[PDB]
Amino acid sequence: QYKIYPYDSLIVTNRIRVKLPKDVDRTRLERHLSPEEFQEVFGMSIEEFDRLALWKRNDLKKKALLF
Structure with missing residues (x-):
């Protein structure tokens, strides 16, 4: 459905x-x-994750430096 990108490069922490x-x-x-x-x-x-809701997946994402 999408393109599996690298987490090391996806992490916003590497925005710099x-x-x-x-x-x-x-x-x-x-x-x-x-x-x-x-x-x-x-x-x-x-x-x-699958068992959790969107709101949860989003929150956890930001914490993981995904957003």
């Missing part, structure tokens, strides 16, 4: 090093990050 590409969204960047990376960068299991 490099900026995000053009073929990437900012509203739902979660879909641009692999499942193993999302659960590895967040801490919980990938299953938790």
